Amino acid sequence: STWVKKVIWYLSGRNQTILQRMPQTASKPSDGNVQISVEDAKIFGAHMVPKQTKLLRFVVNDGTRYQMCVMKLESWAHVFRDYSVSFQVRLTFTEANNQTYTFCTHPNLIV
Amino acid sequence: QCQRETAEKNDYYRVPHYWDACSRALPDQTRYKYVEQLVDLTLNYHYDASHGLDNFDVLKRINVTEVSLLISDFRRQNRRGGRTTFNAAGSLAPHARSLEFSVRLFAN
Amino acid sequence: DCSKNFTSPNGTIESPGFPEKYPHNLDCTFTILAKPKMEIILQFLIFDLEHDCKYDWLDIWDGIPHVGPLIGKYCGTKTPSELRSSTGILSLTFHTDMAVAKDGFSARYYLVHQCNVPLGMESGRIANEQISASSTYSDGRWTPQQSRLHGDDNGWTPNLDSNKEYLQVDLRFLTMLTAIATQGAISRETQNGYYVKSYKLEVSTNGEDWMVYRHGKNHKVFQANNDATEVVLNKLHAPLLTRFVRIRPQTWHSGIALRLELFGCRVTDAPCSNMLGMLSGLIADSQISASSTQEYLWSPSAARLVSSRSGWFPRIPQAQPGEEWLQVDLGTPKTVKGVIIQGARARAFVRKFKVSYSLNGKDWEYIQDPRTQQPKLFEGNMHYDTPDIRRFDPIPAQYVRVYPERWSPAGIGMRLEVLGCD
Amino acid sequence: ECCEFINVNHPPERCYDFKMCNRFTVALRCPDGEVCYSPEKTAEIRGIVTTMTHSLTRQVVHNKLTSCNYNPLYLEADGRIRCGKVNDKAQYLLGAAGSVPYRWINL
Ligand SMILES: *[C@@H]1O[C@H](CO)[C@@H](O)[C@H](O)[C@H]1NC(C)=O
Ligand SMILES: *[C@@H]1O[C@H](CO)[C@@H](O)[C@H](O)[C@H]1NC(C)=O
Ligand SMILES: [Ca+2]
């Protein structure tokens, strides 16, 4: 079966060591001299499309009123010729039709 | 720190973005604990999209509160890791606010 | 709803229900939109709103509301003085609270239609609401409102003769000044008196920040009346563009006395230049674009000349000379005649720049100077607030870009408006 | 005038706007229409309005003291609003939030 083989392909990369190590090294205070092995970088290069973008909507209730807002997620991956890997994200919030100041753009959170 | 006694001067005037400009910075452990969740979930979503999954169960779980707090914190001071491993920057504007960050891992 | 739109040669306006009390929780807005080259004159005839006010108010905008400059917020029982505009759009906004109302307002609107015509200090064209000062003396016999040049009455004096005390007048619309005329004042009741010997001019577009007139590197001190008997007038070597004007004395022979006159012009009274609407808001927010921005979340409203709190900056303040540009699409083919350029508030300004245009996309013509040697370069501002106007041969276009080439060491930063015609 | 009457014996439920008119009196937009109210305990206006503060949409709070550019605002016990400061006790603020209540919706 072709689709079976495509599922096998998809699940083969899932558990990759980079996809575990990244969120740790993104959270530690320093940990800059992280080593990653060349073969792991190679198999990372095999699995990521250089672009993705998504919109998702959500609703917030300000007491009696309701307000609808669009989150945009856009993300990129790359592999340098020196086998370095790079991943980046940009995440934005906006009113579902543009507005000057709204609960989604300015929650004024108490902290 | 904020220019507190220049912004706070009067009861009946505040420069816009005042509250987000001088609300207190997050405890640093909390900051890392939120960043770890966000990097994890967005990397999962990217791999799954790279293979054409819809992946809605993952996208459901990004907490808008926590990202908004990080946007504020990286606006007060955009932060950088330990050839520097990491970068994060906030941005804030009337119609929108945003977060941008990157993680890099090195062959050497 | 109540948000009636008007364009007709003569008419009337009022809050819903007149002379009856206006409803609660209104948020009405009204627009007067003039034909080209036609003045708007607006005169109020009743004003009584219950109360800088906090509950109910009338705003007036020199443009679309929340886009054009605010003319004023008006409230209580002082009838807003008659106002005249050439910018072509004048909008009113009426806010009411949930709970209290009074007789409201009614007004009437009309239309009609060198550079040394008096603005109208003597002729009441500056109403008593437009004049103010730092303080009065205790006696109330030298108040600001009497500063009419040929008023056979005492001049102004503040509580102390000193160099910080000031007189201020608000010319509600952008207006161009050519000369300042002065008289001293003997007291009519007691034949001793006061007169100014020298004084300084402070000018602003916005009133929150200022520029003090200079001629050469030194600040100017003007020379003034020898005694209170006769008029003196002093003429500016090139016209200033201003909204607020403030006179500060510097040396008084025996007390401070000011009677004053303001000579000038409208910018609309060059041959055919009208502002196409960066200031008034008629260039919508989608029509302004730039090569780069100081952050990803740019807001194009920063470009406007007097309605923007802070100006544009490129992504890097020290960009490559002539690499960055700012563009407007005028939305229709138009004659362009000139532009007005201003600094941005870092506090920085553009010093030399060039202009380029096309009737269509993917094309760029250069507005070369008449001589064959090189493309025309225009001298810009010398200060972050005071605008400067530059004029060139008739150029039909629809896309216009401005390219900086020299800037204040704090980087490129700018605000802009374009003078067009048909 | 803002009141000539009192229309109430206890604070009406689920109301949605307020304005104080005398110093001694406060009146409310409520589902049934407006009510004018007074507590004899002259401090209680603050408690009453605080107990109603959940309803007030961000624009209604911005119409008051509107120079405060949508930033949170505070109640003195005598009823006058001022701009709140970032240090102020979180109870006595309107327009602040403890969290953004949110629900993803499918596309
Ligand atoms: C979002 O985060 C806040 C604090 O960070 C927490 O109290 C809340 O339960 C979280 N909600 C979700 C859905 O994760
Ligand atoms: C409009 O009003 C002006 C006011 O001076 C008057 O001169 C003019 O005749 C009026 N025109 C009409 C058509 O009423
Ligand atoms: Ca009212």
Author numbering:
A (entry chain D): 104 to 214
B (entry chain E): 19 to 100, 104 to 129
C (entry chain N): 148 to 198, 207 to 268, 276 to 507, 517 to 593
D (entry chain C): 29 to 135
Show sentences the authors wrote:
The HCMV Pentamer, composed of gH, gL, UL128, UL130, and UL131A, enhances entry into epithelial, endothelial, and myeloid cells by interacting with the cell surface receptor neuropilin 2 (NRP2). The other critical tropism-determining complex is the HCMV Pentamer, which is composed of glycoproteins UL128, UL130, and UL131A and the same gH and gL proteins that comprise the bulk of the HCMV Trimer.
Here, we describe the cryo-EM structure of NRP2 bound to Pentamer. However, when the same experiment was performed in the presence of 2 mM CaCl2, the affinity of the interaction was determined to be 2.2 nM, roughly 15-fold tighter than previously reported. The addition of 2 mM CaCl2 enabled us to form a stable ~230-kDa complex that was suitable for cryo-EM screening. Notably, the calcium-coordinating loop of domain a2 (residues 251 to 258) forms a sizable portion of this binding interface. Additional contacts are formed between the C-terminal β strands of ULs 130/131A and a loop formed by residues 453 to 461 of the b2 domain of NRP2. Whereas the NRP2 a2, b1, and b2 domains are clustered tightly together at the apex of the Pentamer, the N-terminal a1 domain is tethered via a flexible linker that allows it to bind near the middle of the Pentamer, where the C terminus of UL128 associates with gL. Ion coordination by the NRP2 a2 domain, in particular, plays a crucial role in rigidifying the loop such that it is positioned to interact with the UL proteins.
